[PDB]
Amino acid sequence: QVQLQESGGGLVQPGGSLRLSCVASGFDLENYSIGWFRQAPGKAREGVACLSKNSGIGHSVKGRFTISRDGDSNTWFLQMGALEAEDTAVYTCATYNRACANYVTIWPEFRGQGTQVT
Amino acid sequence: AENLWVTVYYGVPVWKDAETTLFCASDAKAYETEKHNVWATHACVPTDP
Numbered sequence: 001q002v003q004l005q006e007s008g009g010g011l012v013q014p015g016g017s018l019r020l021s022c023v024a025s026g027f028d029l030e031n032y033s034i035g036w037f038r039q040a041p042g043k044a045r046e047g048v049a050c051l052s053k054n055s056g057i058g059h060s061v062k063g064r065f066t067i068s069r070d071g072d073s074n075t076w077f078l079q080m081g082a083l084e085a086e087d088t089a090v091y092t093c094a095t096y097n098r099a100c101a102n103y104v105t106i107w108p109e110f111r112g113q114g115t116q117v118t
Numbered sequence: 119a120e121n122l123w124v125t126v127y128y129g130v131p132v133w134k135d136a137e138t139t140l141f142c143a144s145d146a147k148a149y150e151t152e153k154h155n156v157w158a159t160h161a162c163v164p165t166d167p
Contacts, residue, residue, distance in 0.1 A: 027148075027150045027151060072153065
């Protein structure tokens with residue numbers, strides 16, 4: 001299976017930092033890229049960040065979010081800084097195309113379950 | 119009887135020493151979850167099961 005398991009959730013004091021992370025296996029994480037969700041009640045689904053495989057850039061919708069990787073380890077870290085009151089949602093790490101194509105709005109497959117960040 | 123005649127046999131169990139080159143046979147071991155090695159076994163052919 002190509003499932004994503006995520007960790008690092010919790011409650012944040014406004015004006016702090018988070019260290020979200022998630023890991024996947026399934027002999028197929030060479031063709032895919034890993035990004036995140038910001039699914040919140042009332043609003044639709046948006047995107048947060050997407051580390052583009054095959055290019056290496058760490059695109060993000062807002063400047064505070066940074067996605068990062070390390071070596072060949074199958075883990076991905078979303079570093080989140082200077083949080084305000086509107087970042088209360090469920091964060092799900094999912095997989096996008098080879099080039100983070102059409103993210104922030106696409107609804108992908110092989111997605112996770114999502115932690116809750118309050 | 120006394121008349122003998124030569125005859126030719128093809129595909130016969132006869133060998134003699136000689137020197138040549140030989141190719142690879144490395145066990146697959148899936149090899150999709152692989153990190154390369156100084157033995158470039160991706161070029162080497164799979165072995166006989």
